[PDB]
Amino acid sequence: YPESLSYPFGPDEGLALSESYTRARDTDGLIRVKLPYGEPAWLATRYEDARLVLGDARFSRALSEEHDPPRARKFNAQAKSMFNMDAPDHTRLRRLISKAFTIRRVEELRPKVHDLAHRLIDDMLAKGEPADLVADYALPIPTTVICELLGVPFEDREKFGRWTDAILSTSTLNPEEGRVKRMELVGYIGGIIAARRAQPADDLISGMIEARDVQDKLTEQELLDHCIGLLIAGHETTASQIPSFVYALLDQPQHWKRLLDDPELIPSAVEELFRFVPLGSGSAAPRYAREDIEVGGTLVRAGEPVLVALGAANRDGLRFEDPEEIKLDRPSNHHIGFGHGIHHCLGAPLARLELQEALRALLERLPTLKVAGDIAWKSEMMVRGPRSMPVGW
Numbered sequence: 496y497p498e499s500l501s502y503p504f505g506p507d508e509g510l511a512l513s514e515s516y517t518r519a520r521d522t523d524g525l526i527r528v529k530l531p532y533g534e535p536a537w538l539a540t541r542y543e544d545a546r547l548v549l550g551d552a553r554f555s556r557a558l559s560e561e562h563d564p565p566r567a568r569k570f571n572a573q574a575k576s577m578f579n580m581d582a583p584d585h586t587r588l589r590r591l592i593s594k595a596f597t598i599r600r601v602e603e604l605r606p607k608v609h610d611l612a613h614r615l616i617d618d619m620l621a622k623g624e625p626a627d628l629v630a631d632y633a634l635p636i637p638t639t640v641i642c643e644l645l646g647v648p649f650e651d652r653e654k655f656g657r658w659t660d661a662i663l664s665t666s667t668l669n670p671e672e673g674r675v676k677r678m679e680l681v682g683y684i685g686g687i688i689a690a691r692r693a694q695p696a697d698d699l700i701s702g703m704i705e706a707r708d709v710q711d712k713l714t715e716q717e718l719l720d721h722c723i724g725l726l727i728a729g730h731e732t733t734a735s736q737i738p739s740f741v742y743a744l745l746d747q748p749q750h751w752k753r754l755l756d757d758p759e760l761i762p763s764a765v766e767e768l769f770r771f772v773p774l775g776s777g778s779a780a781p782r783y784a785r786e787d788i789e790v791g792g793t794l795v796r797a798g799e800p801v802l803v804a805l806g807a808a809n810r811d812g813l814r815f816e817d818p819e820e821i822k823l824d825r826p827s828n829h830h831i832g833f834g835h836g837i838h839h840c841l842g843a844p845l846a847r848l849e850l851q852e853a854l855r856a857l858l859e860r861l862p863t864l865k866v867a868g869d870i871a872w873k874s875e876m877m878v879r880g881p882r883s884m885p886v887g888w
């Protein structure tokens with residue numbers, strides 16, 4: 496075992512990845528990391544190693560329960576979500592929920608997201624520069640979508656935004672905030688669930704309630720924890736990615752310009768930005784080896800955790816030529832920005848649609864878009880990206 500390195504590596508600001516990732520990915524075998532909490536772990540940074548750990552069934556998410564897992568947050572809720580499980584329980588839960596999220600299902604949302612984006616832009620223009628691209632655009636878009644899909648009132652977004660912020664915090668200042676704010680959110684969601692039981696609506700929460708109450712296909716806690724997981728993943732991810740994508744395109748303005756000239760390139764460009772633009776401030780959730788297994792030149796013994804550095808793997812020059820360059824037309828772009836295998840992002844079709852429409856509207860309406868102040872990047876959070884992003888035009 497190599498001496499453990501402190502992790503996460505950072506940085507928080509901009510789109511760079513720490514040189515420590517490059518060094519690790521260049522080095523034979525896996526490296527060892529120690530996070531603020533839990534046991535030390537292996538870190539996988541090469542593309543092939545990442546995909547083995549994420550997609551080979553000899554690695555487990557469920558086994559985490561037998562451990563004090565490597566992590567940046569003190570509280571481990573051990574939620575009953577599909578993401579914390581292996582087959583067959585993962586399969587059961589995903590099978591029920593995924594119908595709401597397929598390309599085929601979410602496509603009807605495209606004009607709705609399009610129209611919302613344009614209305615938000617109308618409002619930014621009416622006010623006058625500067626706008627905050629986060630508060631005025633990037634946050635409302637995905638929040639509106641997940642609220643309407645799940646059945647969580649958009650009017651409550653200040654409340655649940657506060658809880659989300661606390662739950663995502665990796666700050667040692669007030670280390671109990673995540674745990675107690677999750678309790679607040681649990682009570683809130685419980686209230687919504689009770690409302691829908693008394694009177695169902697055309698939303699995913701009501702659908703899951705039927706799956707449990709009528710079909711006995713999931714437990715009460717599974718129901719609760721999927722409401723929570725989907726609400727948070729449903730908005731915070733996209734809300735971070737929109738401004739980061741825009742920053743990438745404006746920071747190297749040849750890319751913004753190419754998309755102005757060639758809007759048909761938007762889907763390809765969005766894939767390249769999912770490859771390049773980091774979402775996590777640190778790695779994928781740990782996977783535990785079920786049995787001894789060789790990974791990237793290292794024997795990972797049964798019971799040992801491996802963290803997958805998605806962002807670093809996405810810049811593996813063994814797989815992606817000129818990996819540190821954005822190439823909007825990059826071919827066979829099978830990045831792992833949405834993961835890979837069993838826990839591949841359920842929200843990927845929705846995220847893709849959201850990012851495509853968010854960029855399309857800004858490119859159409861604000862071709863002269865520019866950063867117009869200090870970008871406050873999220874710091875000491877599970878996610879990376881601008882918290883506020885002053886823009887002009």
Ligand code: HEM
Nearest residue numbers: 577578725728729732736779780833834838840841842846
């Ligand atoms: C830019 C937007 C998004 C990105 C980059 C993203 C990224 C990811 C990644 C990398 C994973 C796998 C993590 C791992 O294996 O350790 C994942 C899983 C997941 N994501 Fe997304 N996500 C995004 C948006 C969304 C949205 C809108 C939803 C909708 C609620 C969502 C729901 C989920 C769920 C339920 C899983 C777990 C799937 C499973 O365990 O089978 N995500 N996401």
Ligand SMILES: CCCC[C@H]1CC[C@]2(CC[C@H](C)[C@@H](C/C=C(C)/C=C/[C@H](O)[C@@H](C)/C=C/C(=O)O)O2)O[C@H]1/C=C/C(C)=C/C(=O)O
Nearest residue numbers: 572574578723724725727728775777778779780781877878
């Ligand atoms: C519904 C299940 C969604 C889970 C994915 C969300 C997206 C993503 C992309 C890669 C990133 C490195 C992580 C960052 C972590 C996030 C967004 C955590 C959110 C929060 O903990 C949600 C899932 C809370 C659930 C709860 O039950 O409290 O997030 O990866 C996944 C989250 C991994 C986590 C929380 C790993 C961990 O905690 O070790």
